[PDB]
Amino acid sequence: GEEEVETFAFQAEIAQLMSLIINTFYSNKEIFLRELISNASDALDKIRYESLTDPSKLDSGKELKIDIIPNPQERTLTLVDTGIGMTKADLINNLGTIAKSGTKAFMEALQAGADISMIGQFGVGFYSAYLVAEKVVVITKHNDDEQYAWESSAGGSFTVRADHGEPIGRGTKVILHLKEDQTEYLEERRVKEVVKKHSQFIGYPITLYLEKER
Numbered sequence: 001g002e003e004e005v006e007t008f009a010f011q012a013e014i015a016q017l018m019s020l021i022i023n024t025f026y027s028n029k030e031i032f033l034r035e036l037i038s039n040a041s042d043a044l045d046k047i048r049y050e051s052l053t054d055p056s057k058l059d060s061g062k063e064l065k066i067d068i069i070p071n072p073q074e075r076t077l078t079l080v081d082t083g084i085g086m087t088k089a090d091l092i093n094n095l096g097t098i099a100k101s102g103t104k105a106f107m108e109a110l111q112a113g114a115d116i117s118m119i120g121q122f123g124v125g126f127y128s129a130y131l132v133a134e135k136v137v138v139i140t141k142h143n144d145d146e147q148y149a150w151e152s153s154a155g156g157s158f159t160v161r162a163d164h165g166e167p168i169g170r171g172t173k174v175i176l177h178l179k180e181d182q183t184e185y186l187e188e189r190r191v192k193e194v195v196k197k198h199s200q201f202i203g204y205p206i207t208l209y210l211e212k213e214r
């Protein structure tokens with residue numbers, strides 16, 4: 001009803017990127033974590049910076065953090081930040097619009113012998129989620145907008161709806177529904193090893209949750 005879903009097509013360039021990400025043979029999948037962590041960090045930087053001018057921007061939650069939560073029984077890995085969040089326009093229009101050129105350069109660079117690990121230099125690392133995820137759900141809440149859920153299982157489309165499930169207050173929760181072959185990422189020990197390798201110096205506390213059972 002009010003949480004009625006609308007389905008949208010990805011920009012052509014982004015659909016091909018995502019296909020390339022899903023169908024290229026590439027073993028170093030763990031780079032997805034660096035990119036999602038990097039995104040969480042920039043969103044937290046943004047809200048911190050804006051809060052300096054206008055401190056009431058933190059009324060929706062003072063704490064600036066990242067939690068990484070592996071759940072084996074649901075086959076999900078979640079990354080939750082208390083960053084700036086995304087508006088409806090961001091999710092439907094602006095993120096796609098901005099990412100076209102990065103996507104097009106990335107693919108050109110791949111043709112010319114760059115590797116998929118370099119996705120972050122092109123501003124489009126979010127889509128490396130599909131190295132490991134069959135489906136990605138993003139819950140997000142920006143100040144003065146309402147909470148939204150974005151979802152996609154690739155194949156060229158995404159859905160956006162109002163989300164009246166549990167309030168996140170402010171931020172983004174990226175829920176990675178992992179592929180059957182990628183369950184190593186549902187163990188804290190693996191997640192820890194990847195965070196130490198690639199994201200040790202992030203300027204926010206990253207709590208790695210321990211799976212309650214394997």
Ligand SMILES: COc1c(C)cnc(Cn2cc(C#CCC(C)(C)O)c3c(Cl)nc(N)nc32)c1C
Pocket residue numbers: 039040043046081083084085086090091095126138150172174
């Ligand atoms: C819907 O899913 C996505 C898609 C399709 C593409 N990219 C991203 C990456 N991304 C982008 C975020 C943003 C923003 C808008 C500004 C920069 C104005 O805050 C943004 C934010 Cl605000 N937070 C996080 N964690 N990631 C973000 C996501 C999550």
